[PDB]
Design a protein around this motif. Sequence first.
Motif, mmCIF file in Angstrom:
data_model
loop_
_atom_site.group_PDB
_atom_site.id
_atom_site.type_symbol
_atom_site.label_atom_id
_atom_site.label_comp_id
_atom_site.label_asym_id
_atom_site.label_seq_id
_atom_site.Cartn_x
_atom_site.Cartn_y
_atom_site.Cartn_z
ATOM 1 N N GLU A 87 0.851 -1.184 0.000
ATOM 2 C CA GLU A 87 0.000 0.000 0.000
ATOM 3 C C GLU A 87 0.892 1.242 0.000
ATOM 4 O OE1 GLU A 87 -2.586 1.598 -0.422
ATOM 5 O OE2 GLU A 87 -2.944 3.049 1.194
ATOM 6 N N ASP B 259 -13.005 -1.873 -8.172
ATOM 7 C CA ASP B 259 -11.920 -0.955 -7.819
ATOM 8 C C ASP B 259 -12.262 0.443 -8.334
ATOM 9 O OD1 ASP B 259 -9.650 -0.128 -6.605
ATOM 10 O OD2 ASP B 259 -8.238 -1.316 -7.797
ATOM 11 N N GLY C 111 -9.291 4.854 -2.924
ATOM 12 C CA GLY C 111 -9.605 3.532 -3.436
ATOM 13 C C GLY C 111 -10.466 2.746 -2.458
ATOM 14 N N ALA C 112 -11.432 2.004 -3.008
ATOM 15 C CA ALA C 112 -12.401 1.206 -2.258
ATOM 16 C C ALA C 112 -11.812 -0.047 -1.601
ATOM 17 C CB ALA C 112 -13.566 0.809 -3.168
ATOM 18 N N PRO C 113 -10.879 -0.774 -2.233
ATOM 19 C CA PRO C 113 -10.210 -1.844 -1.475
ATOM 20 C C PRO C 113 -9.475 -1.310 -0.258
ATOM 21 C CG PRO C 113 -9.754 -2.066 -3.792
ATOM 22 C CD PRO C 113 -10.384 -0.723 -3.621
HETATM 23 O O1 F6P Z 1 -2.748 5.412 -8.451
HETATM 24 P P1 F6P Z 1 -2.171 5.487 -7.049
HETATM 25 O O2 F6P Z 1 -2.240 6.930 -6.575
HETATM 26 O O3 F6P Z 1 -0.734 4.995 -7.054
HETATM 27 O O4 F6P Z 1 -3.032 4.497 -6.036
HETATM 28 C C1 F6P Z 1 -2.834 3.107 -6.122
HETATM 29 C C2 F6P Z 1 -3.791 2.426 -5.159
HETATM 30 O O5 F6P Z 1 -5.196 2.360 -5.799
HETATM 31 C C3 F6P Z 1 -5.572 0.827 -5.776
HETATM 32 O O6 F6P Z 1 -5.275 0.278 -6.999
HETATM 33 C C4 F6P Z 1 -7.033 0.738 -5.473
HETATM 34 O O7 F6P Z 1 -7.193 1.607 -4.414
HETATM 35 C C5 F6P Z 1 -4.854 0.370 -4.763
HETATM 36 O O8 F6P Z 1 -4.690 -1.060 -4.650
HETATM 37 C C6 F6P Z 1 -3.413 1.132 -4.876
HETATM 38 O O9 F6P Z 1 -2.675 1.032 -3.643
#
Ligand code: F6P
Lengths: 324, 325, 328, 325
Positions: C87, C116, C211-213
């Motif tokens: 994350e 997502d 993000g929803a997850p």
């Molecule tokens: O596009 P960004 O700002 O890097 O965010 C990525 C995040 O969005 C997701 O794909 C869905 O929230 C996550 O799994 C990931 O951590």
Amino acid sequence: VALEAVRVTELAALASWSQMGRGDKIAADQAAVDAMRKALNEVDIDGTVVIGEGELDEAPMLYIGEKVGAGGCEVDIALDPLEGTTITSKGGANALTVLAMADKGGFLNAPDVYMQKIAVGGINAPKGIVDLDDSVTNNLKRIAEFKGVHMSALVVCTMDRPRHEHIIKEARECGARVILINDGDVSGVIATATENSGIDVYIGTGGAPEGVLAAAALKCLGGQMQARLIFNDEEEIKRAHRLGITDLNKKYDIDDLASGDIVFAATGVTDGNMLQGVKRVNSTRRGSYAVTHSVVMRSTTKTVRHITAEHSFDFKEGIEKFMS
Amino acid sequence: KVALEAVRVTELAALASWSQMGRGDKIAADQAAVDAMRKALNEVDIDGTVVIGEGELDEAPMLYIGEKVGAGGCEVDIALDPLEGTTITSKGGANALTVLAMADKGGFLNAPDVYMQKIAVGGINAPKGIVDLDDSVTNNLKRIAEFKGVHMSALVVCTMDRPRHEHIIKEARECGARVILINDGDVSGVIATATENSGIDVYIGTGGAPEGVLAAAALKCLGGQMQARLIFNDEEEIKRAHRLGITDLNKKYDIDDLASGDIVFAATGVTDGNMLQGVKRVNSTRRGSYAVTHSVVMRSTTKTVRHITAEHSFDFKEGIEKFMS
Amino acid sequence: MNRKVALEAVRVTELAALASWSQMGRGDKIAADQAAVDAMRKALNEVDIDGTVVIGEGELDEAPMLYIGEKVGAGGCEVDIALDPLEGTTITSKGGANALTVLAMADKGGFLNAPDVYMQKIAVGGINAPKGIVDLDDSVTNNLKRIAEFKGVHMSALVVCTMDRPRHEHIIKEARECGARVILINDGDVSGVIATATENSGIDVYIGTGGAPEGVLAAAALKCLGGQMQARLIFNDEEEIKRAHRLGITDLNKKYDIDDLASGDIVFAATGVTDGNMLQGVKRVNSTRRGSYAVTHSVVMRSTTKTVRHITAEHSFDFKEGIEKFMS
Amino acid sequence: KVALEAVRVTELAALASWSQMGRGDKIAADQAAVDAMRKALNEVDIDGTVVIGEGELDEAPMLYIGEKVGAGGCEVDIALDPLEGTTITSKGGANALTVLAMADKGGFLNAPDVYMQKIAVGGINAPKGIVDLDDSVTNNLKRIAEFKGVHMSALVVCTMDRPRHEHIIKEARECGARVILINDGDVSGVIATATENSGIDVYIGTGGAPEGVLAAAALKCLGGQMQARLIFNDEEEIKRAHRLGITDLNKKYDIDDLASGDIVFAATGVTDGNMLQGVKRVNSTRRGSYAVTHSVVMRSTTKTVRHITAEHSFDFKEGIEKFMS
Ligand SMILES: O=P(O)(O)OC[C@H]1O[C@](O)(CO)[C@@H](O)[C@@H]1O
Ligand SMILES: [Mn+2]
Ligand SMILES: [Mn+2]
Ligand SMILES: [Mn+2]
Ligand SMILES: [Mn+2]
Ligand SMILES: [Mn+2]
Ligand SMILES: [Mn+2]
């Protein structure tokens, strides 16, 4: 007269915190400056501000040359009532309030211009472990071998600025890791000498007072730092000439920035890579308080104190009572 | 003006005491701490009269009752113990402290060095009257458990492991309370009642009156209630007390009567205890070898409390006795 | 489900965190996510569960994944497993704050099955916070005074956290106009939301869209720590509403309570990659008693027993080799 | 592999013991620990045989030597103390632990419950032979002081306060070493030599043999050296050594001889001690009231050490005796 400095930075940090996350950098700096002068004038020194909120025609409080204190030993005073005014208004990482003392002349007296900096911590590090005019990798190699680790284990810290793209890229070709801070290079420099900070080297260009303040702390923790002033204007160059600078390109060792009997004190405003930020705490034991995390240190004795202060307060009232 | 500067005194007394830890020599321990403390205290910008100390000028040469200390400043009364737990330290047991307290003139109870019944509870909001020495252990613990919002069997009561306390221990244990014993150190044990995460809710015991006044001073800063009564076994002791102006020999003293006004309190741990951690030897890459001290300094007027972890440089290739005066 | 299923999950987040950390500050968000996925997938197959992934990483080019529907462990109870190997891939790539490795487990069906998409989030901690204290349909000022009254503090003492994104300028302005303090994070609203219930985070309320997850993952933690949270999925285009319908969602604008995001027997485990407002990051330590090691800081917690564990782990490593020998 | 779930076994053992802390009833302390540790051990997915426990079957009903524990899993030898320091916990003293170690079959010196000479030092790099029960105390310390890079006057030697160590103390002090005494708990006291910031460099003493094996199982994961030797005083004591296979009665055991192979070691603190913080009652408003435990868990093979601070929800309005079976 060292330990008293920490209540100065403590009160300034509480004032800054009342304005954290308000989006008003003027009001955060003003709160800090007010708290710092009020507290600094109850310290038994005859202090002369040699680094502070600005020169007199710009800054009515804590200006260059102002005399401060209640009377006592003659001391040169290097302040930043709030390092990270924009950080504080945003609630970002690495804001501090800082106060350093030296015997008169102990600090590089330079204009508020940019400064190239390289810094590393360690007790037993030869002056010359870092050289500004050497390449990043040759600097990193010398450092990696002094610390006893593979170059790729080093963590280098710099600021997220375009002026730093070549440093970031060069240290990354030969394996080193390079983390970026959005602001706060007083904190970023001192982190190189701060246990569990996770930062081994700081490389980058920031403000010159901010570099002298950090050098003061590195002088008490152990470590090396080389610095060069950078001029953009022509009044900056005339400002420097007036102060006795003949060599615009001079390199400064850590001793040239801060020598002799140095006292350094700092209090976290926000969580950063050197100090933890001010926090609100409840407890049945003593009710509610603000916690501050500070560090005061001394170059002569090499003693470092880590201070966690509980300051009573009733947050049922407006937070802006932490302003003086 | 001089509060933070008091930690440096208890730090130096504690490094001095620590070099004597586990050496079997309670006299060398006490002497190293007294020398370190008096050297350090003369170099603090106060004009201090010792009102609680190592002894009367007859018995103790240094830090005696009445001795002037300080380098010059405002007039303050000095309550100190260079080394609380000389026997503790000589053996490396728990709860040894160095202590230093300062008040306005007359702020500290002026009592002879007799025994003293103590009962202490922590809590900024605890009402005066929550503990009473004429009342029984059960009824004291009863009110405390009620104030703290816990069943009485969750309360942890601390006392010293002494024959004189045998009935304290059983009375508190009949009605379900937990009662733990410390081998020495009722300065730390009283103060632990108002120390976060000490695990000790109540202190009940009898020990020295100086130790009682020092602990009362810290509790006046941390918030809490304490009651005390001086104990007289001898006729000189009662003459002793009349001349200090005491007339009611079994008065019950409150916290306010033990320490009042603008109190500053400082302590440094010598060995690990239920209030502070002891001195330790540490090695590191970044600064080499140092001793770490853990200290607390606090002030009654502001209620500010500071926890101080200090790093004092030293090379242990030499003997350890190079942390003395 | 059983008692084996809790403390062993921290071994997973710790190995992913170490692999992410060898890529900290390398400027390669792909290599960082790849290390985290590979380490996590290898460690996760040493955990006596017949797990089915219901929540994967992010994108299929942004790295591989434990894909939704993949089966892991294969030796245990019917467990739904929601997980984010890294994350904060961007965060990790430049050593910013708030990067975490996350694993959550539930009984089959316990996690919200959503696409997502972005999601509106409003979160506060406190185990006595009554459901209703935060409502997305109420104004920001009106949630904040409801929170200030329940925390027994003036509104100007509250610290609201949100992401430095243009879509949040309105929440920032509206919260500052009636006195509240609003701090910004560049990224990391798993850490940001869970912060509201982490002792001494300094964060009282999180309000923001992400993000929803991530939201479900944060919710699984909050369910364990005590707290309230309400969420609403957000849809920009039709090709993405179709995703919602395919998954059983009919009410595009449903408000989701924390029970709806995560229900029943929940296990949450996380390890910090960088320092953040929930967890300290990985650090290299030197010592003589045990040589050199890497220290990780993790948390593991269960919703049925309310038990929360903070785990500081020492993993030995020779820092004379490349740091790249932490990947897996 | 179930290795980390060991932690929750010692945590429950510790919460049960704590509910008897300061009750002056050591059997009730021990009993509560014994059910708490036997009940939760049976949820661990191991097939375990108690090779070290709180007694033989005809002396101890529960967790007896040879008892089959677990719910099914890899065959493992189980080394338990449900409560180390039953008297300690009864009076609230320092160093009480709960302990649980796992190994492949035959990994632990199947030792009979007899006294055991002990000497232990911490450090990943110490060569086997740095300590030897037959060398003098002054020669062992000089060697350790050399290895740790300090003057022998900086060493802190630990030992129990028992007359049998009158001479350990005196000889070690006589060439300048510092010797601190613990009233009990030489599991914590031995492991402390390898615990960071314990303050203790060397342990030398004589105590129970099972407690020696449990300690060496932990030093095996932390890095260290330790010699032990069984001691016998009854013909009945020697018979138990003969029953259990032991022929060489005066054997000196190495660390590997006490514990060898794939070792997991878990301990939770009951009271504050020189190795672990004890259980504490905590009141926050963010999560209500809880008991906090402080545990450590390590494996021999990977050398990974995990320190685990756990928060256990509990209502302290209720009697403290719910933390039991
Ligand atoms: O596009 P960004 O700002 O890097 O965010 C990525 C995040 O969005 C997701 O794909 C869905 O929230 C996550 O799994 C990931 O951590
Ligand atoms: Mn500034
Ligand atoms: Mn500047
Ligand atoms: Mn004394
Ligand atoms: Mn006395
Ligand atoms: Mn992700
Ligand atoms: Mn036992």
